[PDB]
């Protein structure tokens, strides 16, 4: 039994809700919140900009030190950093950005990072400003993630389309 509330159950392990991931993170304090990161951990907009804003820029400060030490992530890769005031940990996951020409096949690799964590609060990878079709992203999620994932979908109109079209 966990503290996530009001989710619709899509499969054995995938749940979905119309929610602001920032607000859901602050209420739940999940062990892991997933950030829709880029390889430079520059959290300027979309989910990443919102999560970082909610940390009063502490996420960005930590991320800049991470990059200075380790260099950029790979597209499809991830790193675990602090969750600050939002979660115990933040799993920064880089889905392919269609608006940069990155290969969509890397979306499966990106979701594989979730399998290293038993329970996660997450957005749909590569959705929003990353330019992929969120229906495709949901399908890859369901077909790749085996651990328990609670998906937050900010847009109510999109949430309803994802549910209604789910196979
Ligand atoms: N605070 C947040 N900001 C951004 N996203 C990503 C996102 C946005 C959309 C979309 C579709 C039409 C308009 O926006 O689809 N995915 C978030 N997901 C959960 N919380 C989020």
UniProtKB/Swiss-Prot annotation:
Membrane topology according to the record: Multi-pass membrane protein
Locations listed in the record: Host endoplasmic reticulum membrane
Stretches assigned to the Macro domain: 1-167
Superkingdom per UniProt: Viruses
Regulation: Inhibited in vitro by GRL-0617.
Coiled coil regions, renumbered to chain: none
Known catalytic reactions: Thiol-dependent hydrolysis of ester, thioester, amide, peptide and isopeptide bonds formed by the C-terminal Gly of ubiquitin (a 76-residue protein attached to proteins as an intracellular targeting signal)
Assembly description: May form homohexamers. Interacts with N protein.
Role noted for this protein: Responsible for the cleavages located at the N-terminus of the replicase polyprotein. Participates together with nsp4 in the assembly of virally-induced cytoplasmic double-membrane vesicles necessary for viral replication. Antagonizes innate immune induction of type I interferon by blocking the phosphorylation, dimerization and subsequent nuclear translocation of host IRF3. Also prevents host NF-kappa-B signaling. In addition, PL-PRO possesses a deubiquitinating/deISGylating activity and processes both 'Lys-48'- and 'Lys-63'-linked polyubiquitin chains from cellular substrates.
Protein name: Papain-like protease nsp3
Organism encoding this protein: Severe acute respiratory syndrome coronavirus 2
Name of the gene this protein is made from: rep
